[PDB]
Amino acid sequence: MHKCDITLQEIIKTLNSLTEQKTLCTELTVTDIFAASKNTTEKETFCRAATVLRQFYSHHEKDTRCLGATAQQFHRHKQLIRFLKRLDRNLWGLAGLNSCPVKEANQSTLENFLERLKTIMREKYSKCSS
């Protein structure tokens, strides 16, 4: 019946935002663990995942190559990072691990990575349910 879960709800809104309004920083190609989830489980996927994302936002905070466009973009990136972090925090819950190394697949231009994650979560929000 419900929710299924709280992490989900939070996550969803966070994934939603990130993609809805993408930037000049969501093309900073990160690892596409989905194409390396080949023979693992959702959790594990979500473990490399967690790691990948965590690092990505933490490291770009002061990249100011993409968020050093003008003023608008600067703020744009700022927003993004906050949401990226939000992802990690809650994601961990679903995952059910701690953290894992990165066994690279191919690369995903963040906006894309997010869209995938987003869809997944949403599907498992309603077909769980509801």
UniProtKB/Swiss-Prot annotation:
It is found in: Secreted. GO terms for biological process: B cell differentiation; cell surface receptor signaling pathway via JAK-STAT; cholesterol metabolic process; dendritic cell differentiation; immune response; interleukin-4-mediated signaling pathway; macrophage activation; myeloid dendritic cell differentiation. One of its GO terms (molecular function) is growth factor activity. Disulfide bonds join C4-C128, C25-C66, C47-C100. Glycans are attached at N39. Keywords: B-cell activation, Cytokine, Disulfide bond, Glycoprotein, Growth factor, Secreted, Signal. Transmembrane segments: none annotated. One of its GO terms (cellular component) is extracellular space. Cytokine secreted primarily by mast cells, T-cells, eosinophils, and basophils that plays a role in regulating antibody production, hematopoiesis and inflammation, and the development of effector T-cell responses. Induces the expression of class II MHC molecules on resting B-cells. Enhances both secretion and cell surface expression of IgE and IgG1. Also regulates the expression of the low affinity Fc receptor for IgE (CD23) on both lymphocytes and monocytes. Positively regulates IL31RA expression in macrophages. It is linked to Ischemic stroke: A stroke is an acute neurologic event leading to death of neural tissue of the brain and resulting in loss of motor, sensory and/or cognitive function. Ischemic strokes, resulting from vascular occlusion, is considered to be a highly complex disease consisting of a group of heterogeneous disorders with multiple genetic and environmental risk factors. Interacts with IL4R. Interacts with IL13RA1. Belongs to the IL-4/IL-13 family. This is Interleukin-4. It comes from Homo sapiens.
